[PDB]
Amino acid sequence: SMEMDEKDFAADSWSLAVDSSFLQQHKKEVMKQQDVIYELIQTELHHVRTLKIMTRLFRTGMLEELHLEPGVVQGLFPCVDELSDIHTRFLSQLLERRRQALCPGSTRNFVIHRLGDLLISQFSGPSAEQMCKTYSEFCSRHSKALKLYKELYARDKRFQQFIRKVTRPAVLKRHGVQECILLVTQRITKYPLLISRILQHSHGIEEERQDLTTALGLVKELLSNVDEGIYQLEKGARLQEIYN
Amino acid sequence: AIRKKLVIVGDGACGKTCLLIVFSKDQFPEVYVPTVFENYVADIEVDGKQVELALWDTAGQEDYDRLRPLSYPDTDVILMCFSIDSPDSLENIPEKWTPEVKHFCPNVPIILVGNKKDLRNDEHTRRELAKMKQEPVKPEEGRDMANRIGAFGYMECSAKTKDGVREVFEMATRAALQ
């Protein structure tokens, strides 16, 4: 991620990120709403930073430093380019929504009144189709990804060294390969939680309460589709084991 | 430092998210309690052994029967959580959660954890549960369920006050080493 966004989202909440004299001019109901929105954005940022660790640090670095069949690498990091594209675009939209909302003369004081519309666009139409298709694929390759990581780590010195090397920094403490894969799989199931809790504090403007309500139901239909599309693959599953 | 993996399972609003949060954050959340937990890797020294312990939540996964299991590979200890102010959350432990965890996590220790023990002597809770003919889960119903499902042990904590929380994760570490 980039320092401008890191700094903007370094604080624990909206209440602590904005200036206190700006805070004091707002009703509590608004602060609570903003808190959860800040969190949705902050977590989406972390989610995108996770995918960039997968693609630039691990995937690319394997390609350019080891002599693995490129199909191996693809088995370790399925769909990561497409996922990078989906979430990075969604983040761009969330971050622009925030910038528009900044007061003149400030890089931190803001209030987002409108979010539902952005969530409906994201979780509907071609964008929703691309997500369902992409997560159905990711989650069905998840296990195979883990087994391949473990096979390679236990059979290859140079691979072992690569991993020790790139994950040695303190900031990678919780972002090794397997962690990244599960972080990604869990992300989609986080959206209903955040959306629900924003909606709880978005009752002042009736069209926003509906936009959020529609959004929530869109996220659940997506999760429901993804859950039905999963069939776990297995490294060297024979033809007979599938049709039983 | 050897590495071990912990997963917390349990019903929506067993307080599992709050519990992971309070343990992993070094300053208690006075200002805002996060909606979600991503992961965390705790450095724990227990009984003279240094362990890295990766923590994971199944929050939001409870209705997605083919997503949820993806949290389980290579788990070394399961915390099975329920809320002491929700006896219906305790009824579900043996029927639903235990078979699942035993299927996907064979031979993995389970610690049963009763969250939110502060509420056992909260007035509003007593009253609210009375209207439905119920009472806060009692210690012995705790221990008895743990016994019945073959838990490695039974523990109680309060994430609101931090009481018991350190001890749960220390014990889970011990359990994961066995």
d(CA A37, CA A114): 10
- Three-state DSSP at B138 gives coil
Q: How far is A153 from chain B (nearest CA, A)?
A: 15
- Domain of B36 in residue numbering reads as 3-177
Tell whether A83 is within 8 A of chain B (Cβ). no
Residues 6+ apart with CB under 8 A from B98: B80, B110, B149
Q: Is B40 marked within a binding site? A: no
A14 contact residues in B (CB cutoff 8 A):
32
The secondary structure of residue B95, as a DSSP letter, is I
Hey, of B16, B32, B52, B104, which one would you mutate to test binding to chain A, going by the most A CBs within 10 A of its CB?
A: B32
d(CA A165, CA A66): 13
Q: What ranges in chain A are assigned the alpha helix state H?
A: 3-8, 14-17, 20-23, 28-52, 60-65, 70-76, 80-100, 116-122, 125-155, 157-166, 177-200, 206-229, 239-242
d(CA B68, CA B11): 13
CATH number, domain of B59, equals: 3.40.50.300
Our count of domains for chain B comes to 1
Tell whether A186 is within 8 A of chain B (Cβ). yes
A185 contact residues in B (CB cutoff 8 A):
67, 70-71
Give the H or E element holding residue B147.
Answer: helix B139-149
Q: Is B27 marked within a binding site? A: no
- Three-state DSSP at A153 gives helix
Q: How far is A60 from chain B (nearest CA, A)?
A: 24
Q: How far is B142 from chain A (nearest CA, A)?
A: 28
- φ, ψ of residue A77 to 5 degrees: the values are -130, 60
Resolution attained, angstroms:
2.3
A189: its two tokens: 């199931």
CB atoms within 10 A of CB A179: 21
d(CA B151, CA B109): 7
- Which chain A residue lies closest to B62 (C-alpha atoms)? A189
The secondary structure of residue B4, as a DSSP letter, is E
Q: Which among A45, A41, A65 has a CA at the least distance from the CA of A156? A: A65
Q: Is B57 marked within a binding site? A: yes
Give B72's Cβ-side CA count (13 Å radius): 20
Nearest to B31 among A16, A142, A183 (CB): A16
B65 contact residues in A (CB cutoff 8 A):
227
The secondary structure of residue A203, as a DSSP letter, is -
Nearest to B32 among A35, A43, A183 (CB): A35
Kindly determine whether residue A197 and residue B39, on different chains, have CB atoms separated by under 8 Å. Answer: no
Q: Chain B residues within 8 A (CB-CB) of chain A?
A: 29, 31-32, 34-36, 38-41, 54, 56-57, 59-61, 63-67, 70-71, 73-74
Residues 6+ apart with CB under 8 A from A124: A218
Rounded to an integer, what is the distance from CA B164 to the centroid of its chain? 12
| Burial B51-80, CB ≥16 within 10 A → b, else e | bbbbbbbbbbbbebeebbbbbbbebbbbbb
B67 contact residues in A (CB cutoff 8 A):
139, 185, 188-189, 223, 226-227, 230
CA dihedral A111, A43, B157, A179 (to 10 degrees): 180
Q: Cα separations (Å) of B91 from A122, A133, B74, B110? A: 39, 37, 27, 17
A230: its two tokens: 């999963």
- Which chain A residue lies closest to B73 (C-alpha atoms)? A143
Domain ranges of chain A: 1-244
d(CA B173, CA B178): 9
| Burial A53-87, CB ≥16 within 10 A → b, else e | bbeebbbeebeeeeebeeeebebbbbbbebbbebb
